[PDB]
Amino acid sequence: FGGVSVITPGTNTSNQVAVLYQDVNCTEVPVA
Amino acid sequence: SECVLGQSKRVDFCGKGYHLMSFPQSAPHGVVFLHVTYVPAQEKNFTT
Amino acid sequence: SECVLGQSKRVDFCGKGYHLMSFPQSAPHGVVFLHVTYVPAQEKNFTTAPAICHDGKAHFPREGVFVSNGTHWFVTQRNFYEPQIITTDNTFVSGNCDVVIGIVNNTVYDPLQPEL
Amino acid sequence: IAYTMSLGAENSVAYSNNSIAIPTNFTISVTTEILPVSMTKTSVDCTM
Amino acid sequence: YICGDSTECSNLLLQYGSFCTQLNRALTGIAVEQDKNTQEVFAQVKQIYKTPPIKDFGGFNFSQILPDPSKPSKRSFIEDLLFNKVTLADAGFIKQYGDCLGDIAARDLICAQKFNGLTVLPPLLTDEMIAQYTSALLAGTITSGWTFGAGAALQIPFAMQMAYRFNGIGVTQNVLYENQKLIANQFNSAIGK
Amino acid sequence: LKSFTVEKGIYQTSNFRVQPTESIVRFPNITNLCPFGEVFNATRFASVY
Ligand SMILES: *[C@@H]1O[C@H](CO)[C@@H](O[C@@H]2O[C@H](CO)[C@@H](O)[C@H](O)[C@H]2NC(C)=O)[C@H](O)[C@H]1NC(C)=O
Ligand SMILES: *[C@@H]1O[C@H](CO)[C@@H](O[C@@H]2O[C@H](CO)[C@@H](O)[C@H](O)[C@H]2NC(C)=O)[C@H](O)[C@H]1NC(C)=O
Ligand SMILES: *[C@@H]1O[C@H](CO)[C@@H](O[C@@H]2O[C@H](CO)[C@@H](O)[C@H](O)[C@H]2NC(C)=O)[C@H](O)[C@H]1NC(C)=O
Numbered sequence: 001f002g003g004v005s006v007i008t009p010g011t012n013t014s015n016q017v018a019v020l021y022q023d024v025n026c027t028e029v030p031v032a
Numbered sequence: 033s034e035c036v037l038g039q040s041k042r043v044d045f046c047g048k049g050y051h052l053m054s055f056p057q058s059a060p061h062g063v064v065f066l067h068v069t070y071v072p073a074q075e076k077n078f079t080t
Numbered sequence: 081s082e083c084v085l086g087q088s089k090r091v092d093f094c095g096k097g098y099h100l101m102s103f104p105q106s107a108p109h110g111v112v113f114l115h116v117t118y119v120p121a122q123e124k125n126f127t128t129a130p131a132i133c134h135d136g137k138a139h140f141p142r143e144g145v146f147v148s149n150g151t152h153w154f155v156t157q158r159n160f161y162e163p164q165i166i167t168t169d170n171t172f173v174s175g176n177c178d179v180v181i182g183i184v185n186n187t188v189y190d191p192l193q194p195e196l
Numbered sequence: 197i198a199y200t201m202s203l204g205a206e207n208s209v210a211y212s213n214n215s216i217a218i219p220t221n222f223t224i225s226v227t228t229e230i231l232p233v234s235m236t237k238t239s240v241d242c243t244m
Numbered sequence: 245y246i247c248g249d250s251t252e253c254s255n256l257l258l259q260y261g262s263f264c265t266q267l268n269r270a271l272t273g274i275a276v277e278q279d280k281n282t283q284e285v286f287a288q289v290k291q292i293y294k295t296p297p298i299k300d301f302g303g304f305n306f307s308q309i310l311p312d313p314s315k316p317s318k319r320s321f322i323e324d325l326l327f328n329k330v331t332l333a334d335a336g337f338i339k340q341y342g343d344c345l346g347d348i349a350a351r352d353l354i355c356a357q358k359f360n361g362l363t364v365l366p367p368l369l370t371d372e373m374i375a376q377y378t379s380a381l382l383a384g385t386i387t388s389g390w391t392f393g394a395g396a397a398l399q400i401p402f403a404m405q406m407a408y409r410f411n412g413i414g415v416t417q418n419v420l421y422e423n424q425k426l427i428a429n430q431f432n433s434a435i436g437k
Numbered sequence: 438l439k440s441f442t443v444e445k446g447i448y449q450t451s452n453f454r455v456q457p458t459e460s461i462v463r464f465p466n467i468t469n470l471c472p473f474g475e476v477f478n479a480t481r482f483a484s485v486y
């Protein structure tokens with residue numbers, strides 16, 4: 001349950017990414 | 033672009049009759065236009 | 081068909097602002113339009129009135145707006161500041177001025193008077 | 197970083213029943229726009 | 245959707261190529277096109293014009309279409325009626341895995357869709373932004389006429405705007421000034437209907 | 438077109454053939470025979486376990 005999206009700039013620029021879990025809280029955890 | 037931001041000479045493009053103004057409103061997955069129009073009435077015969 | 085071969089009155093159909101001319105150019109699997117537009121700038125505030133009573137009748141401007149610089153009234157066109165003396169030739173008359181709301185007292189000049 | 201997008205710059209118009217703003221100068225602008233007209237033509241040999 | 249765990253099915257799905265990738269690409273293209281259409285339709289003015297110094301519009305009454313500053317959402321009365329008329333299901337828009345396994349006895353099909361991989365994504369522009377865009381457009385078209393569309397907004401009395409719009413249809417402007425009290429009333433009655 | 442009459446225009450046909458008209462066989466030059474005797478004629482066969 002719960003779709004996952006990856007947010008990133010161009011890999012030619014940096015390696016840092018962000019993760020968006022859809023239709024879930026952060027308090028209920030299963031998130032990292 | 034044409035009716036809200038100006039005055040359109042196109043016939044029946046925005047409501048029946050001559051067009052004066054339009055007002056936009058939002059709606060679920062849509063837009064609603066209120067068109068203000070000028071309609072003649074009480075005509076009379078004359079010799080020309 | 082509409083913009084290159086003529087002049088279009090449709091708003092924002094070909095660029096922002098009033099439309100003057102367009103020029104077409106080719107491109108790989110496409111076309112590119114260069115639109116020439118006229119944009120007003122450097123606006124100024126003025127005091128305006130709907131009409132004027134001179135002989136008791138309401139005088140409306142034939143074309144443009146009635147403006148005032150503070151002490152005197154003039155008539156000017158829409159998109160450019162071109163003040164001119166209020167005259168019977170650029171104004172018309174329709175009925176008494178007891179009905180028009182916000183009308184302003186002034187004098188209407190007649191160029192016919194000096195010749196006589 | 198994450199943020200709420202900005203719709204645009206806030207502005208207001210000084211409205212009154214006897215004041216009108218008249219432009220005094222003008223500018224000529226040129227704007228470019230691009231429209232696709234066609235694409236590549238393809239063919240497929242089914243048997244091969 | 246095709247397998248639902250059962251690693252044997254997932255392994256057997258690999259021989260069919262990139263059909264799922266093509267489906268996902270098409271769906272993503274449609275999703276992007278939806279937001280593009282919304283932005284094209286509504287985001288046409290750069291300045292968010294605020295409501296003028298308040299009700300001096302030559303006797304015309306625009307209280308129905310102007311936004312209501314008291315309600316939590318800055319909608320108008322007509323916009324509120326339109327929102328109430330159209331019905332939507334799941335008016336929380338979010339269902340985590342803490343209310344999907346609950347006492348719902350399979351009455352809601354939202355969980356039936358979610359358990360099979362079907363997901364609904366949120367639009368980029370919330371209704372609270374479309375309302376602001378509409379309010380800005382209304383303020384611009386009420387205070388400055390058509391000038392704000394072509395460039396910088398220039399203030400003008402509403403009666404004169406009505407006179408010039410009357411001139412635009414081949415009727416002399418004086419006819420407005422001799423019948424203004426009628427027209428405004430008619431306008432009000434019309435919107436009242 | 439699956440018809441006996443063709444209207445004016447241009448039409449597409451099948452690809453050019455380029456028939457090979459020749460058969461070539463390449464195999465390793467192995468001359469010995471497989472162990473048919475000492476495998477099928479084995480006096481003793483191992484048990485199943
Ligand atoms: C408004 O317009 C009138 C007409 O031009 C101005 O009157 C003239 O002003 C100039 C100096 O600016 C004088 O030299 C003239 O003698 C004036 N003409 C008359 C008949 O008096 C008037 O000054 C302008 N007022 C403002 C505030 O701009
Ligand atoms: C209207 O705007 C233009 C600029 O867009 C003005 O032209 C400039 O005038 C200044 C001097 O005042 C010059 O230094 C610039 O070189 C001019 N720019 C261009 C492109 O010509 C013009 O003067 C303005 N018109 C009026 C009456 O003020
Ligand atoms: C414009 O229309 C609205 C509604 O028709 C008017 O608001 C009403 O004003 C009266 C008197 O205070 C109240 O009793 C009503 O409850 C109001 N109705 C609503 C929906 O708020 C408003 O007065 C009108 N404005 C003008 C200048 O006529």
Ligand SMILES: *[C@@H]1O[C@H](CO)[C@@H](O)[C@H](O)[C@H]1NC(C)=O
Pocket residue numbers: 024025027338
């Ligand atoms: C997280 O759980 C709390 C408790 O019900 C709830 O208020 C909240 O709506 C949940 N988060 C979201 C985004 O719905």
Ligand SMILES: *[C@@H]1O[C@H](CO)[C@@H](O)[C@H](O)[C@H]1NC(C)=O
Pocket residue numbers: 075076077
């Ligand atoms: C004008 O003349 C025709 C024929 O006499 C008649 O039908 C029509 O009613 C007249 N118009 C009006 C407003 O009476």
Ligand SMILES: *[C@@H]1O[C@H](CO)[C@@H](O)[C@H](O)[C@H]1NC(C)=O
Pocket residue numbers: 123124125210
């Ligand atoms: C016109 O008047 C308003 C309010 O006084 C002011 O905000 C505006 O700057 C004036 N216009 C110009 C060009 O100064």
Ligand SMILES: *[C@@H]1O[C@H](CO)[C@@H](O)[C@H](O)[C@H]1NC(C)=O
Pocket residue numbers: 181182213214
């Ligand atoms: C404009 O508004 C003022 C109120 O401050 C009023 O005194 C004046 O009569 C109004 N003029 C017109 C033409 O409406």
Ligand SMILES: *[C@@H]1O[C@H](CO)[C@@H](O)[C@H](O)[C@H]1NC(C)=O
Pocket residue numbers: 133185
């Ligand atoms: C304009 O002129 C008439 C008579 O000439 C006069 O009655 C009226 O008071 C004048 N208007 C104003 C606002 O004074």
Ligand SMILES: *[C@@H]1O[C@H](CO)[C@@H](O)[C@H](O)[C@H]1NC(C)=O
Pocket residue numbers: 473474477478
């Ligand atoms: C096995 O032995 C017999 C007699 O010695 C012979 O005839 C037969 O060819 C042998 N089988 C094979 C596969 O060589």
